[PDB]
Amino acid sequence: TNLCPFGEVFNATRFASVYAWNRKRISNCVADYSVLYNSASFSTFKCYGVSPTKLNDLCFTNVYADSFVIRGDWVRQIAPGQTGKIADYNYKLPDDFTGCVIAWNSNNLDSKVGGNYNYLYRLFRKSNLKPFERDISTEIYQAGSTPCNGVEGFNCYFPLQSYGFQPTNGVGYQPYRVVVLSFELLHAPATVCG
């Protein structure tokens, strides 16, 4: 009977950074996706392996929603088979993805004033993430001749960097909130339905 907790995902006070992104799991509820597709707010809402006008017919073994903030020029990396620092080192979707990516401009709800809130992404890593791997470690990264094995210095870097949004200005570099819905089809009792 109960409506699913999408309000706890889409209307939260602050969304996470793109390293250390939030994940919500959704179960034992009715998921009406019609109020998502017919909401006016969304700048992108792209679905893979399901079509949005049919989500209200389907039932899923379990549902996940992942949420974070990125610049409007990075949202193209939030798709299967993409490449770049976000897709490699911060958040990766598998090549065989069943789910939808939803994004909207948040420059009214965030970045509205002087200073900043501390949004960080990982810029350096020794190898790519696996699909849905999350990495929150902040050990020094080596980037040159000889190990530093300690303090920051010549050819060693702290792995995180700030996004550098334009100061309540610009055009493409503004903040976009993202929610990624991922749907399971494992042969067990269907915990979410339309």
Ligand X SMILES: *[C@@H]1O[C@H](CO)[C@@H](O)[C@H](O)[C@H]1NC(C)=O
Residues that bind ligand X (CB under 6 A): 6-7, 10-11, 35
Q: Please identify which residue in the block is written with the tokens 């550098």.
A: 164
Q: Which residue is nearest to ligand X (CB)?
A: 6
- Closer residue to ligand X, CB minimum distance, 33 or 97: 33
Least distance to ligand X, CB of residue 30, Å = 13
Least distance to ligand X, CB of residue 69, Å = 17
CA distances from 127 to 22, 91, 96, 123 (A): 22, 13, 21, 12
Least distance to ligand X, CB of residue 105, Å = 16
The partner residues of 100 in beta bridges, in order of sequence, read 47, 181
- Closer residue to ligand X, CB minimum distance, 11 or 108: 11
Least distance to ligand X, CB of residue 85, Å = 30
Least distance to ligand X, CB of residue 159, Å = 34
- Rounded CA-CA distance 3/56 in Å is 13
- What phi-psi label fits residue 6: left (phi over 0), alpha (psi between -120 and 50 degrees) or beta? alpha
- Closer residue to ligand X, CB minimum distance, 36 or 87: 36
CA distances from 94 to 150, 169, 176 (A): 35, 34, 22
The partner residues of 47 in beta bridges, in order of sequence, read 100
Distance separating the N- and C-terminal Cα atoms of the chain: 11
- Closer residue to ligand X, CB minimum distance, 121 or 183: 183
Say which amino acid occupies 120.
L
The partner residues of 64 in beta bridges, in order of sequence, read 25, 182
